[PDB]
């Protein structure tokens, strides 16, 4: 009755856990609002400000964050959030809403769903 | 060690709690 996804950037990996909740989003045991690169806050809050609070009605997301740097971690977190929402709308919500979210996310920023293939080279 | 190596596939986002998650977990070399 829940969804377990991941999002990656270079080495940083975030694992997102989406479930029937009450509109609470917390990452690595802490809210998104208080994570230290607050100059990079709006990249963290990306699907919330693109989608609004309504699409987070009964949604509880807990994300583990591990590896990488700082910026790579932020991009991994936001990719994990978007992928968790998409997979929940695949599994428990209708198809049309999911393809609507995929349309708006691909139209806005490609990285939010598909990962950067490039990684540090030997 | 060498036999415990596990490889994912990424298409819809992978759901680890989906019963069809094994279809997106690889054990051998692609290509």
């Amino acid at each position: 009755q829940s969804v377990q996804v991941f999002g990656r950037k270079k080495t940083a990996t975030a694992v997102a856990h989406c479930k029937r909740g009450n509109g609470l989003i917390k990452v690595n045991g802490r809210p998104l609002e208080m994570i230290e690169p607050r100059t990079l806050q709006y990249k963290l809050l990306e699907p919330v400000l693109l989608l609004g609070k309504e699409r987070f009605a009964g949604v509880d997301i807990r994300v583990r964050v591990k590896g990488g740097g700082h910026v790579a971690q932020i991009y991994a977190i936001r990719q994990s959030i978007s992928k968790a929402l998409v997979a929940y709308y695949q599994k428990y919500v209708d198809e049309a809403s999911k393809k609507e979210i995929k349309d708006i996310l691909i139209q806005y920023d490609r990285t939010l769903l598909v990962a950067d293939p490039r990684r540090c080279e030997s | 060690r060498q036999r415990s190596r596990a490889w994912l596939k990424e298409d819809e986002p992978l759901n680890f709690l989906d019963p069809k998650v094994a279809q997106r977990v690889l054990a051998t070399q692609p290509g």
């Binding site: 377990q4 990656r8 807990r62 583990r64 | 596990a6 490889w7 994912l8 596939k9």
Partner: peptide, 26 residues
């Protein structure tokens, strides 16, 4: 890219198992 790679996916599966276990704890 269509596949994650050995090491990153190993870390991802360990992370997902740990998160599932800590949600099972509470």
């Amino acid at each position: 890219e269509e596949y994650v790679g050995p090491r990153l996916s190993r870390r991802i599966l360990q992370q997902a198992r740990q998160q599932q276990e800590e949600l099972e704890a509470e």
